[PDB]
């Protein structure tokens, strides 16, 4: 019955190390609406900003969670997502080719 969310973790601009950018985590295609979305650096959650819950024509919702960040060779960024359709929280590491 519940629909599994699909996750995309990417940056707004073509990223270069040390240059400030905007990290984004785009979660979509899920149901029920209540979801846990977190952007982490080196395993700890960051202060995020989440858009307002809208849905597509197939009645599945989408959400955008974004923050400011500086791509670095020392720090690795991720995105955690927990849903009722998942047995355990999923994680997607960010890479410039995403």
């Amino acid at each position: 019955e519940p629909r599994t969310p699909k996750i995309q973790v990417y940056s707004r601009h073509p990223a270069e190390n040390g240059k400030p950018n905007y990290l984004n985590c785009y979660v979509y295609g899920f149901h029920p609406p209540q979801i846990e979305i977190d952007l982490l650096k080196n395993g700890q959650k960051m202060k995020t900003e989440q858009s307002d819950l809208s849905f597509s024509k197939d009645w599945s919702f989408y959400l955008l969670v974004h923050t400011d960040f500086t791509p670095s060779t020392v720090d690795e960024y991720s995105c955690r997502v927990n849903h009722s359709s998942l047995a355990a929280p999923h994680m997607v590491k960010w890479d410039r080719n995403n």
Partner: protein
């Protein structure tokens, strides 16, 4: 070829918390402009776009009262629909509403819609005649009869042909630089080898508006839509969108494949090819 003013409602409950949560958003084409979330301390109808920012005092005072009362009828409606399906009172269920109007060249109303969904499945929907409803279930017939005897279709037909068209025309005029904007995408093809005989070609399309775009891979003219792995269009954050289409090809044959992009921001469709 047309424009859209669309609203989205969402009401859902959960065990323990009791009082459900209501969220309402409004979009003009692919750009939102209004927000209402009941989780705020004193929930108002808040703007999201710089062209609805001005407006007039009553527009925010009335739509706040409209959205606040809309939050109340849909928390009662959640229990009503649950009772129609006769489900336990301790669970968690959702109600979604999607109404809007598509307008053409000179104010022509091409199509008006107003549909509801319960637990992700279609529940009630207004027909294209805009005078009667269609019901998916038999439990939804309780809502259909209630909306039939109340004459809510005549009310719905008056909004979609009147206020929905004029406000979309008002939005398009006041946000012309944002709504009627047609930004073309910056495109390029990256090349990721994956195995001894396979590489991956990823055809990118970045920073474009509106959202409607076509990304197609072709092998010497033959369409490869079935063999491609298309990704969903994602918002870049600053009002634009991004998209890429992948394809696994034999190693050494990357020059026999071409990516074709189509977007209203480009006067002619593009045809790209990978260069080392």
């Amino acid at each position: 070829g047309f424009h859209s003013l669309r609203y989205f409602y969402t009401a859902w409950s959960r065990p323990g918390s009791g009082e459900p949560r209501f969220v309402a958003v409004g979009y003009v084409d692919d750009t939102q402009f209004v927000r209402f979330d009941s989780d705020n301390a004193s929930p108002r109808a808040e703007p999201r776009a710089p062209w609805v920012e001005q407006q007039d005092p009553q527009y925010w005072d009335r739509n706040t009262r409209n959205a606040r009362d809309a939050a109340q009828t849909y928390r009662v409606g959640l229990d009503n629909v649950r009772g129609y399906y006769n489900q336990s009172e301790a669970g968690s269920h959702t109600i979604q509403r999607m109404y809007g109007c598509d307008v053409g060249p000179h104010g022509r109303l091409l199509r008006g819609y107003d549909q509801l969904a319960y637990d992700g499945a279609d529940y009630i929907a207004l027909n294209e005649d805009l005078r009667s409803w269609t019901a998916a279930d038999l439990a939804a017939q309780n809502t259909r009869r209630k909306w039939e005897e109340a004459g809510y279709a005549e009310r719905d037909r008056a909004y979609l042909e009147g206020e929905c068209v004029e406000w979309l025309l008002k939005h398009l005029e006041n946000g012309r630089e944002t709504l009627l904007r047609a930004d073309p995408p910056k495109t390029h093809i990256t090349h990721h080898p994956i195995s001894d005989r396979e590489v991956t070609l990823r055809c990118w399309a970045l920073g474009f508006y509106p959202e409607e775009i076509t990304l197609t891979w072709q092998h010497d003219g033959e369409d490869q839509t079935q063999e491609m792995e298309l990704v969903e269009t994602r918002p870049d954050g600053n009002g634009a969108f991004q998209k890429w289409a992948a394809l696994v090809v034999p190693s050494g044959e990357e020059q026999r494949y071409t990516c074709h992009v189509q977007h209203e921001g480009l006067p002619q469709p593009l045809t790209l090819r990978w260069e080392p």
